[PDB]
């Protein structure tokens, strides 16, 4: 369980980088609109900028699903860990005068 929380924060830090990348790409297209009308003619590099957006949206998904499977396992780890200690006190309770 302890390992999972840091694996949880490791992926979430990358999710900001995916989100930051989506701002970088959209920022660039706004600057690509600043060019004068002679240069405004669309080119191949505009398709590449559109190509970057679709990937980051799709890469957002795999990291989104990365944590959703991380959460459901992480809760099941707690409950088993919870009941395991609960059951430990049951047998430990009749050894209270013993050394244990």
């Amino acid at each position: 369980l302890r390992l999972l929380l840091r694996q949880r924060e490791a992926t979430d830090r990358r999710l900001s980088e995916v989100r930051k990348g989506l701002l970088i790409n959209q920022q660039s297209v706004k600057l690509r609109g600043y060019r004068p009308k002679c240069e405004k003619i669309p080119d191949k590099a505009d398709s590449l900028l559109v190509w970057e957006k679709k990937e980051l949206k799709s890469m957002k998904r795999k990291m989104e699903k990365d944590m959703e499977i991380s959460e459901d396992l992480l809760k099941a780890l707690a409950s088993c860990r919870d009941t395991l200690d609960f059951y430990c006190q049951e047998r430990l309770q009749a050894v209270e005068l013993m050394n244990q």
């Binding site: 694996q7 992926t11 990348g21 099941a76």
Partner: protein
């Protein structure tokens, strides 16, 4: 036992998917920014003959 068996397989994939998705993203930007330079060379080249 079951959750321990489930956990170790899950944890590796989170680390494995982490690095690749980190690695893929940097590849997207390098190729994309190269083409913008590729558009720059032609516009600088045409400016010479002008």
């Amino acid at each position: 036992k079951r959750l321990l068996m489930e956990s170790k397989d899950i944890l590796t994939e989170m680390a494995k998917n982490e690095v690749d998705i980190q690695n893929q993203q940097q590849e997207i930007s390098n190729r994309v920014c190269s083409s913008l330079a590729q558009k720059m060379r032609e516009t600088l080249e045409l400016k010479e003959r002008m």
